Design an enzyme around this catalytic site. Structure first.
Site, PDB file in Angstrom:
ATOM      1  N   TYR E  23       0.827  -1.189   0.000  1.00 20.10           N
ATOM      2  CA  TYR E  23       0.000   0.000   0.000  1.00 20.10           C
ATOM      3  C   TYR E  23       0.883   1.270   0.000  1.00 20.10           C
ATOM      4  O   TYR E  23       0.373   2.368   0.075  1.00 20.10           O
ATOM      5  CB  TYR E  23      -1.024  -0.041   1.147  1.00 20.10           C
ATOM      6  CG  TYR E  23      -1.971  -1.239   1.074  1.00 20.10           C
ATOM      7  CD1 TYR E  23      -1.978  -2.194   2.062  1.00 20.10           C
ATOM      8  CD2 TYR E  23      -2.874  -1.387   0.005  1.00 20.10           C
ATOM      9  CE1 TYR E  23      -2.835  -3.285   1.996  1.00 20.10           C
ATOM     10  CE2 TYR E  23      -3.735  -2.423  -0.076  1.00 20.10           C
ATOM     11  CZ  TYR E  23      -3.701  -3.419   0.921  1.00 20.10           C
ATOM     12  OH  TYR E  23      -4.550  -4.497   0.824  1.00 20.10           O
ATOM     13  N   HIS E 100      -8.876   2.513  -4.947  1.00 21.82           N
ATOM     14  CA  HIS E 100      -7.968   1.476  -4.335  1.00 21.82           C
ATOM     15  C   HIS E 100      -6.567   1.878  -4.629  1.00 21.82           C
ATOM     16  O   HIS E 100      -6.188   2.132  -5.783  1.00 21.82           O
ATOM     17  CB  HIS E 100      -8.315   0.089  -4.896  1.00 21.82           C
ATOM     18  CG  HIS E 100      -9.747  -0.245  -4.691  1.00 21.82           C
ATOM     19  ND1 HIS E 100     -10.236  -0.666  -3.471  1.00 21.82           N
ATOM     20  CD2 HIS E 100     -10.821  -0.121  -5.508  1.00 21.82           C
ATOM     21  CE1 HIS E 100     -11.543  -0.825  -3.556  1.00 21.82           C
ATOM     22  NE2 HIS E 100     -11.929  -0.474  -4.773  1.00 21.82           N
TER      23      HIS E 100
HETATM   24  O1  LIG Z   1      -6.037  -1.280  -2.586  1.00 21.03           O
HETATM   25  C1  LIG Z   1      -6.741  -0.744  -1.653  1.00 21.03           C
HETATM   26  O2  LIG Z   1      -6.696   0.479  -1.303  1.00 21.03           O
HETATM   27  C2  LIG Z   1      -7.744  -1.626  -0.874  1.00 21.03           C
HETATM   28  O3  LIG Z   1      -9.108  -1.104  -1.008  1.00 21.03           O
HETATM   29  C3  LIG Z   1      -7.244  -1.615   0.446  1.00 21.03           C
HETATM   30  C4  LIG Z   1      -7.459  -2.685   1.338  1.00 21.03           C
HETATM   31  C5  LIG Z   1      -6.759  -2.462   2.509  1.00 21.03           C
HETATM   32  C6  LIG Z   1      -6.639  -3.249   3.627  1.00 21.03           C
HETATM   33  C7  LIG Z   1      -5.941  -2.516   4.574  1.00 21.03           C
HETATM   34  O4  LIG Z   1      -4.800  -3.089   5.053  1.00 21.03           O
HETATM   35  C8  LIG Z   1      -3.711  -2.335   5.343  1.00 21.03           C
HETATM   36  C9  LIG Z   1      -2.823  -2.866   6.283  1.00 21.03           C
HETATM   37  C10 LIG Z   1      -1.658  -2.164   6.585  1.00 21.03           C
HETATM   38  C11 LIG Z   1      -1.373  -0.934   5.944  1.00 21.03           C
HETATM   39  C12 LIG Z   1      -2.262  -0.408   5.013  1.00 21.03           C
HETATM   40  C13 LIG Z   1      -3.429  -1.136   4.708  1.00 21.03           C
HETATM   41  C14 LIG Z   1      -8.072  -4.058   0.925  1.00 21.03           C
HETATM   42  O5  LIG Z   1      -8.981  -4.675   1.920  1.00 21.03           O
HETATM   43  C15 LIG Z   1      -8.734  -3.926  -0.461  1.00 21.03           C
HETATM   44  O6  LIG Z   1      -8.895  -5.204  -1.075  1.00 21.03           O
HETATM   45  C16 LIG Z   1      -7.814  -3.082  -1.356  1.00 21.03           C
END
Ligand SMILES: O=C(O)[C@]1(O)C[C@H](CCCOc2ccccc2)[C@@H](O)[C@H](O)C1
Ligand SMILES: O=C(O)[C@]1(O)C[C@H](CCCOc2ccccc2)[C@@H](O)[C@H](O)C1
Ligand SMILES: O=C(O)[C@]1(O)C[C@H](CCCOc2ccccc2)[C@@H](O)[C@H](O)C1
Ligand SMILES: O=C(O)[C@]1(O)C[C@H](CCCOc2ccccc2)[C@@H](O)[C@H](O)C1
Ligand SMILES: O=C(O)[C@]1(O)C[C@H](CCCOc2ccccc2)[C@@H](O)[C@H](O)C1
Ligand SMILES: O=C(O)[C@]1(O)C[C@H](CCCOc2ccccc2)[C@@H](O)[C@H](O)C1
Ligand SMILES: O=C(O)[C@]1(O)C[C@H](CCCOc2ccccc2)[C@@H](O)[C@H](O)C1
Ligand SMILES: O=C(O)[C@]1(O)C[C@H](CCCOc2ccccc2)[C@@H](O)[C@H](O)C1
Ligand SMILES: O=C(O)[C@]1(O)C[C@H](CCCOc2ccccc2)[C@@H](O)[C@H](O)C1
Ligand SMILES: O=C(O)[C@]1(O)C[C@H](CCCOc2ccccc2)[C@@H](O)[C@H](O)C1
Ligand SMILES: O=C(O)[C@]1(O)C[C@H](CCCOc2ccccc2)[C@@H](O)[C@H](O)C1
Ligand SMILES: O=C(O)[C@]1(O)C[C@H](CCCOc2ccccc2)[C@@H](O)[C@H](O)C1
Lengths: 143, 143, 143, 143, 143, 143, 143, 143, 143, 143, 143, 143
Positions: E23, E100
């Site tokens: 991310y 996303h």
């Molecule tokens: O790609 C994206 O922004 C998502 O919407 C983000 C998510 C994010 C999950 C969050 O997890 C994190 C953990 C640590 C640091 C940042 C995000 C996931 O559930 C989606 O499939 C894709």
């Protein structure tokens, strides 16, 4: 005297003053009033509650399970998504009537599936707000 | 005065005197009587009819379409199977309420799908014979 | 002289005087007349028949099988539902042309599947009532 | 005077002199001639064109969209595969008749699905080369 | 002056200081700062908010619906799971841009499906944190 | 200086002067101009090209692979259909941004699937023609 | 003395004098005779009945349910299609043996599914007309 | 003397000088040379041709059908997508050997399905460029 | 000393004093005690926590991710539904053991699928409350 | 004289002395005796054999193929799983009758599918041990 | 010197003297001889073995894994059914070539899926017995 | 004293000395020793057995059914494939614990389905060889 829990899930606090084309022009406070008016006519008490919080809904389901009281539940989008809420509802020993305001079968394919229907006593869909009044009448006869 | 057609499909002539564990102990003739009793209370007339013949059901649907009268339809196994019966029902300009005595979602997977729900005003399932009395009450308010 | 059986299934007796937005403004009796007019032009005889009864349709299919005469069949909702009617049609030794008035592929997903197409000579859909006149012209050339 | 574009897709240049068991013994040049003969009888002009190139087919579809002229299209294997060709066809404001020589429902399961049917006026399948003559007759009446 | 609500769902408070391989290395507070910096450049105001609570997200969606303000929403795992959140978003009258950070199509099959895309104005995926800056630029031009 | 290839697939030559309700009123030549105007502002060069020919698209993809230059690709109907075009795109070592003008998730189910998304850097859908301007801005920052 | 109802569904009146390659050269009247001959040998009475009418089949099923007599049922195409007929059969308290003349598993995929098998005592398929004689022998031993 | 057509589809002109990890380090011109070297050893003539154009591939398939000569075809992404190309290949009266350089079963699920395999004599996958040399050896023995 | 987080999801606060036929007669407070008793025996510390709130569960998962401590997680109905909770769990660098009290494979088909299993170290199902004691023993050996 | 091979697959050696609620109280040795008793009555010889080994079953199938003798096969769990055993059975030139003791359609969904039915002469299910006696009677008449 | 294990699975001991229309007229002993003849020509040794026993096949796979020798495997019906045999094959460090005599894609849908292809070096299907000779030639060059 | 049967299926004889990255570095003989060491500590006797033969596994399952002793079963690839082995296991009256060394949910989709889980007492996956020691501890407490 029968006590009946009417429980509304996410987004249904916005009833009537939003999306009247879909969910009708009755507001949530008017809904409450109509349910309490009908309950008096039937010699019952209705406790009408709404929450956007699944945790809060589960707590209200738990309490009705502990009291062995019936529930009229419109779970909103959680109808199609929540196993948690189904398993709390499966615990109820008194009747559970599932209510949808809209006809969920005349809409997107995903709304045609409910986690709740299989464990409910029965289901009423698409009859608008009368749905709830009709569920209350069933529960008044099935005591 | 509102006239309401109550239409029962295949096998429901055997109500009450058969399979009381599933469909309840009310017989088809008692069902008729309860519906006519409730109709009088509501200031309506109910015409209650049952047939095992899809052709005969379609004719009764046609007639209600021509009269613009509402219909309460429990189509039995044809709920899950008949496009013919759906297309006759789609023609109705007054409300169509789909009724199942049993909760069709607590049973085999195939009963969870209805050709009728998407074109019905609304659906009531699993509330036994009261289903019909409740549908009649909705139609009395939605005139 | 070729004799051609034109067979209409459930609900198509209501043609033209109902649902003109979907199935067109030609009534069933006018349909009959247009088919008989075109048959004379082509040096054939058309026997045009409609029934809401699957049993009655099967009998008409049987008779054309016994006479080795061709059939133009619009089976209505039974197109998508009836294996019985497919197996009676599979028996025909002369050509079977499947006709839909509406384009059944521009509608609900379930209308896109026909039990009849695989055993038909050919299929004509969405060309309205001309569908039948065109099928009759094919059968006049394919004798 | 109506001008009608008849458009054949991949492999159909080999008609008649190949695979006569499947697609019939009429060659592509004879097909052209039969279509032009029938057009004269009907007081129309047919422009009959075939290409193995999707780009070239799209251009011919574009031109008919710009002229607001009707199209009879047998897209061959692209019927089941091409969204590009469907979206060019969706643009047509005059009628689009989809034609298959063979009955595509009596064959492999994949031929039973068309990208084109849902956006076509209508479909004619399995009536051989007459398919095209019949489509031309519909378009002559629907002006 | 346009006010734009930027709303982050579950787990996105951990941005940048966790899982930088997935991310990106920008933290949630830096994200806020970049969005507010870009908003000033564009003559808008951004309200940037994150919550792990679906109830809290729904409330923020409700408020933007009431104010008729646009929303840039990255709902995290709720993108693929929540009908509740879709129905609150469907209510928005101003544009809704789904964002996303990661390319959700280069990952597990379940991330390829969004409840939100069908009711969003548009979607931006896999462009990292710039996703949000780009959504803000669209909304600045589409007023 | 970064050079960016903007590549439009089948039917998109008809932009703006056709189907303005779907794909917007900007024509392909205006699109070119807007992209070249924005490129100058960003200190880049855009080469904007459209073809209805898959072979021609593959050649343009090949050339960008050989030059290691980025690509903004709106492949039109080939997005949902072409493995050939995906495998040419998979070869690109510089970023590939997939663009749809329309929101392909608010349309037929088949448009919701892209062969390209899994191998693209990122995707932008439903933001109209700005889609391309926004992709160009990402690529200007990601050098 | 055991009485056994042998019930044939749609199209099976044409047995033997039609489609002998599929369903064998024994006619329906010869079938009757063979069943009555075998019944005498076994000390039982067989009532052998055929109808193309689902309504008529349901009535014969009802009567056997009321008499608590066993049934040998070859429902023809209704095997794969009718929930109505399954629910009448589910009511039988004496054994129900499902018979197919043809091996329905060596045919189209749709014939491999029966609504009746799950509620039948047992099933016999592909053994031709002996199927019925064998079912009668089982029922003679299971009294 | 046997003449054998070796036909490569989209993207395979880039062999060896691109993606050597996937498709091997042999270039298309070296491939040609190896095939012609092996053909001489076997007393045959190989005509080795590659095109990114489906229209051009179909023409080469047509010509081999007309000459009744065998074909070794690696259709690239069109293997999984093209019904047009399958129907041209189905026409071949001499053997058709399908070749993939890569093992298409150790990759994405979509590469595991070929339109060509069912109508090919046989298939060779994952043996790299030797695939073609081995196909040529089969065709030398099967004349 | 190893610290282990034991985390129970929705409805599991009702353990033992409800649904003892399904989830066993041990209450949540007794569960806590048994886990702390076993932890002392093993020279570890167990922090045992339950919440009906997904937001609250995510926070507890976050904290264990930050501390790099292991987790034993019984997520209840969220096992089958929550991508949010899976993505918080995927972040854990120490082992994650998934526990179900009931055998989720001997129940409804939907319980057979877990979002958590693929990202867990391991899974223990159907061994009742011992499940947790056994998970704790694994984590004591895998440090 | 006809010789008939009766072949039982895995687990059926435990018949009668295990699981009498499912597969009946007749043991495998009693089964043998009943089959040999009935064979004498019919003027045939039955060779009755059981094995838990697929290799051993295949050998017994091979031998009956070489002798052109018929087979009554209850393959147990291999019915639903073994292509090997189907391909050995497909080789038989004399009739193959598939037998299940239990009604495999009143059980788990996976038992409703047989690899054997499509290549068998016929199938008998749910008639208990009489299944085998009835199969033997068919084979005595079909010589 | 390379040693190559050729391993045939269930039913392939019957090659040539059975089902010559499907699997060819070469017997298993002739197959052995042809493979040993070709091995000498290539300067290799072939060990050719067949078994109807999965246990025995696994042992032969194990031994080749221990010796790091290549394998040519035609697993017969186990190709489509056995995970055990796939996992033994996945262990091989030298190349594994999957061979089918018949073209398994021109047959029933179930033969189109192999557990082995994804873990094999490569696959050769439908080239009859030459399949094996060609696999041996690949392995001679890939040492 | 409790006797516990530990049964390993195909390929697991190669444990530890093969594929240590997947199934761990403990060999089958060390596994035996660890299980017997732990059994002594618990006051039980473990009989640890492995076979590549399904017939042999079924026999060991049968014997434990006859003795009413518990079983810890790691069936290897047969977990996902064998109905025979499930039906022998379903017979056990004492507990059956299913063990996988690897986490079968972090692997190919096909390993996520077990024939055994629904009829097992419980399942332990992905905890390596400790899996077995933990199963033995459950069975020691559940007597
Ligand atoms: O790609 C994206 O922004 C998502 O919407 C983000 C998510 C994010 C999950 C969050 O997890 C994190 C953990 C640590 C640091 C940042 C995000 C996931 O559930 C989606 O499939 C894709
Ligand atoms: O028809 C119903 O009552 C529903 O259960 C209600 C829902 C309600 C969503 C709430 O959204 C609202 C927004 C504004 C005003 C009222 C409701 C929806 O998620 C279900 O599919 C059908
Ligand atoms: O629940 C209902 O009312 C049904 O629509 C009724 C049916 C009724 C079948 C009728 O069978 C009966 C047999 C004896 C007594 C009453 C009904 C069934 O086919 C639908 O799935 C559910
Ligand atoms: O398009 C056709 O002709 C159909 O076969 C006709 C049907 C007709 C239903 C009849 O309904 C009518 C109602 C009023 C007037 C005319 C027809 C429908 O069930 C098929 O899907 C399509
Ligand atoms: O039935 C038709 O007209 C088709 O649209 C024609 C096709 C034609 C393929 C062309 O192949 C030919 C080969 C030789 C001669 C004529 C046609 C096929 O791809 C469609 O499924 C059905
Ligand atoms: O939304 C987009 O940009 C698309 O990629 C464009 C397509 C465009 C088709 C082109 O059709 C046009 C016709 C007239 C004017 C402009 C475009 C369609 O095939 C994709 O599903 C969505
Ligand atoms: O194999 C059977 O007995 C069937 O149940 C019979 C059917 C019979 C259809 C009747 O058609 C006939 C036509 C002419 C002569 C005899 C039967 C069919 O719909 C089922 O799939 C299989
Ligand atoms: O394995 C093969 O030979 C393929 O048929 C080749 C393809 C080749 C795509 C061509 O891409 C290339 C790019 C650079 C160099 C060589 C090939 C692919 O689309 C098939 O799934 C498998
Ligand atoms: O077997 C388990 O531990 C579960 O993860 C527990 C759940 C528990 C639901 C909680 O319901 C309870 C109600 C009363 C008492 C205890 C639990 C369920 O949603 C999963 O499918 C299986
Ligand atoms: O109903 C039948 O005869 C079966 O073919 C028998 C099986 C028998 C399994 C054997 O298990 C037994 C265990 C104890 C006693 C008898 C049989 C089963 O795998 C098939 O689905 C149905
Ligand atoms: O095509 C092949 O070689 C197969 O792998 C062979 C099989 C062979 C079955 C063996 O049956 C035979 C029977 C008689 C003679 C030769 C083979 C079959 O199960 C696969 O689907 C295809
Ligand atoms: O994780 C497990 O224990 C398995 O049940 C084991 C298997 C084991 C296959 C055995 O292969 C081995 C090869 C070498 C060394 C050890 C095991 C596999 O088929 C299951 O999907 C998962």
């Amino acid at each position: 005297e029968l006590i009946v829990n009417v429980i509304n899930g996410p987004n249904l606090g916005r009833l009537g003053r939003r999306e009247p084309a879909v969910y009708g022009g009755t507001t949530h406070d008017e809904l409450v009033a109509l349910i309490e008016r009908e309950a008096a006519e039937l010699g019952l008490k209705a406790v009408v509650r709404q929450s956007d919080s699944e945790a809060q809904l589960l707590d209200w389901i738990h309490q009705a399970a502990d009291a062995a009281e019936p529930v009229i539940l419109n779970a909103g989008g959680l109808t199609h998504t929540s196993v948690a809420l189904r398993d709390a509802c499966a615990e109820l020993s008194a009747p559970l009537i599932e209510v949808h305001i809209s006809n969920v079968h005349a809409r997107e394919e995903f709304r045609r599936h409910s986690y709740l229907s299989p464990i409910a006593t029965g289901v009423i869909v698409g009859l608008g707000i009368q749905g709830y009044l009709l569920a209350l009448r069933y529960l008044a006869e099935h005591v």
